[PDB]
């Protein structure tokens, strides 16, 4: 955002929307891949507490750790705290989830992760 | 732009070709609108 | 094949409360009374061409008389499938009626049944019939807490529906008859409209068929059936269907849940329903076949219901 003459130089997704509080416009401009754009947005949002420092935002981009209540987690662990198998979020077996893939598509709902 | 001239037509110094349409009475000037892309891409807000 | 050796049907149930016309189970006037063979019978023998998985095929007219469609009374919604066992008793999956975790707890006065339907979204007044449930019996051995064991539910209709070409009960195999048919290597038949796929899967891309659909599925080995699931499987449930090779998932999730699994018996020219199309791993998990709930042993139990209504 700062260093006004940045909009004439080429840019770095990391030298605009990472090491600096950025516009989703410059984010949109730099991303275009609107799926990953939503991903980066989701990042930003969850990383709202990971805005600083820089390496914290880098880790929040890695996504292996759940931020706060766990909106950002994108790992491969699909097991409950006590070893019970996780039911498919979209499937109705054995429970029909009021809160499921249709209601939360932006969390990247995997098989049972 | 360097060295580009175009004679006035109306009295108030506004350039514009007077087309022959039922005569030379009328001038053809169109209007076009624009809004922010990114800022008004995903959303709508009546894209003011 | 049966030639000059006719196995007669033995009446195990009294007609007074089990219903009349018991001797005429699974006999379609259009096909059975004129010895007309359906175009889909040529695949019955398990000695067929290298056992390649056959896609879904549309059933003929009047070839599914024992199928029943369990519908929501209010509002309008298709619920499940069911099997016609007699002119005054119906058999349906218990999970379609009772599932407190599913927010599903239906009384006798909240669901209806439709018999003899051709198209789900249409209404052909003359040939199809509707009925409203009155009494429901649940077997105490129905265990939905561990593996959906014994998915059995019995229903009684207040106003009986007489015999017709598109509505006719299916025969009930016993223990010896089931053993003989299963050791003969004959494929099973599952009829439905794809409501099982809607209920137990979120797979969007293959719309729910409003036309009567039929799928042929043979049986596989029981120890392999045990090894095919991470959840314990009782003897009352068995595997059926082709093995879905890697790269594609099988059609085990076709049809309606609670529907019949029938085989045309070669010894008496009759159709015997091995059990109920219950929930299996063929829907939720790829690489699995259809798991079906056995009801053939329940003959002695069946009369135990109508012995309550012998007044
Ligand atoms: Ca800047
Ligand atoms: Ca900037
Ligand atoms: Ca800078
Ligand atoms: Ca820019
Ligand atoms: Ca920029
Ligand atoms: Ca940097
Ligand atoms: Ca822009």
UniProtKB/Swiss-Prot annotation, chain A:
The Gla domain sits at: 1-46
Residues modified as 4-carboxyglutamate: 6-7, 14, 16, 19-20, 25-26, 29, 32
Q: Where's the Kringle domain?
A: 65-113
Q: What protein is this chain from?
A: Activation peptide fragment 1
- Please state the gene responsible for encoding this protein: F2
Name which cysteines form disulfide bonds.
Answer: 17-22, 47-60
Q: Where are the transmembrane segments?
A: none
What is the taxonomic lineage of the source species? Eukaryota, Metazoa, Chordata, Craniata, Vertebrata
Superkingdom of the organism of origin: Eukaryota
Q: Which residues of the full protein are shown?
A: 44 to 156 of 622
Q: Which residues are glycosylated?
A: 78, 100
């Amino acid at each position: 955002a700062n260093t006004f003459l940045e909009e004439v130089r080429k840019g770095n997704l990391e030298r605009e929307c990472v090491e600096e509080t950025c516009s989703y416009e410059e984010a949109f401009e730099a991303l275009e891949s609107s799926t990953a754009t939503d991903v980066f947005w989701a990042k930003y949002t969850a990383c709202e507490t990971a805005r600083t420092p820089r390496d914290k935002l880098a880790a929040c981009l890695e996504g292996n750790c759940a931020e706060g209540l766990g909106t950002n987690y994108r790992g491969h662990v699909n097991i409950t705290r006590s070893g019970i198998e996780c039911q498919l979020w979209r499937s109705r077996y054995p429970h029909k989830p009021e809160i499921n893939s249709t209601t939360h598509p932006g969390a990247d709902l995997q098989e049972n992760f | 732009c360097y060295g580009s001239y175009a004679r006035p037509t109306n009295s108030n110094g506004g350039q514009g070709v007077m087309v022959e349409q039922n005569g030379k009475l009328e001038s053809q000037v169109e209007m076009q609108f624009f809004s922010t892309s990114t800022n008004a891409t995903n959303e709508v807000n009546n894209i003011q | 094949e049966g030639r000059t050796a006719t196995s007669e049907y033995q009446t195990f149930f009294n007609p007074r409360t089990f219903g009349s016309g018991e001797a005429d189970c699974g006999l379609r006037p259009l096909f059975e009374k004129k010895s007309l063979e359906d175009k889909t019978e040529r695949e019955l023998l398990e000695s067929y061409i290298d056992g390649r998985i056959v896609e879904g095929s549309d059933a003929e007219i009047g070839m599914s008389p024992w199928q029943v469609m369990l519908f929501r009374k209010s509002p309008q919604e298709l619920l499940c499938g069911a099997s016609l066992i007699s002119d005054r008793w119906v058999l349906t999956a218990a999970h379609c009626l009772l599932y407190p975790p599913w927010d599903k707890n239906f009384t006798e006065n909240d669901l209806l049944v439709r018999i003899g339907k051709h198209s789900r979204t249409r209404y052909e007044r003359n040939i199809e019939k509707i009925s409203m449930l009155e009494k429901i019996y649940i077997h105490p051995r129905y265990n939905w807490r561990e593996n959906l064991d014994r998915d059995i539910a019995l229903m009684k209709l207040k106003k009986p529906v007489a015999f017709s070409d598109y509505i006719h009960p299916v025969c009930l195999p016993d223990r010896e008859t089931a053993a003989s048919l299963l050791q003969a290597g004959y494929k099973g038949r599952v009829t439905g409209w794809g409501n099982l796929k809607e209920t137990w899967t979120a797979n969007v891309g293959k719309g729910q068929p409003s036309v009567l659909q039929v799928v042929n599925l043979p049986i596989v080995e029981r120890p392999v059936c045990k090894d095919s699931t991470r959840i314990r499987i009782t003897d009352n449930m068995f595997c059926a269907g082709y093995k879905p090779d890697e790269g594609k998932r099988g059609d085990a999730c076709e049809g309606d849940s609670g529907g019949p699994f029938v085989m045309k018996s070669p010894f008496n020219n009759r159709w015997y329903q091995m059990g109920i199309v219950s929930w299996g791993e063929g829907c939720d998990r790829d690489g699995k076949y259809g798991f079906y709930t056995h009801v053939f042993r329940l003959k002695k139990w069946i009369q135990k219901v109508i012995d309550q209504f012998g007044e």
